[PDB]
Amino acid sequence: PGQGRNNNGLEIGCVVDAASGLLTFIANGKELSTYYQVEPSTKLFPAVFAQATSPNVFQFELGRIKNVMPLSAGLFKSEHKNPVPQCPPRLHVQFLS
């Protein structure tokens, strides 16, 4: 739907339910129609494909929303029951080279 494209930075939220292998997306507090169903034991890497049209392109935000654990909880087994979002030094950004 119709936005100003610039009132606030676009926030695309990715939600992964690993117990059911269901991938859903949120545009702006609004569930998107696109969804995916992955096969069991799939290992999914968060990914962004971008063609830069600005000095500032985008940013990963490793937070959480209501009733959902943060990404660090599933990434690290030591934080499997830690609701507080974390970005340990092991997690970093890689690019196709």
């Binding site: 990715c14 992964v16 890497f45 971008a50 392109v57 990404l71």
Partner: protein, 34 residues
């Protein structure tokens, strides 16, 4: 706020991507890869 028991029992994880103003959203894809 949220339900602590549900938050502990859930296997649902979240992350987000903020596309800054001035960057064309048609040139940005967000999701997961293997």
């Amino acid at each position: 706020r949220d339900d602590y028991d549900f938050l502990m029992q859930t296997s649902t994880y979240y992350y987000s991507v903020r596309i800054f103003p001035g960057q064309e959203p048609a040139n940005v894809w967000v999701g997961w890869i293997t």
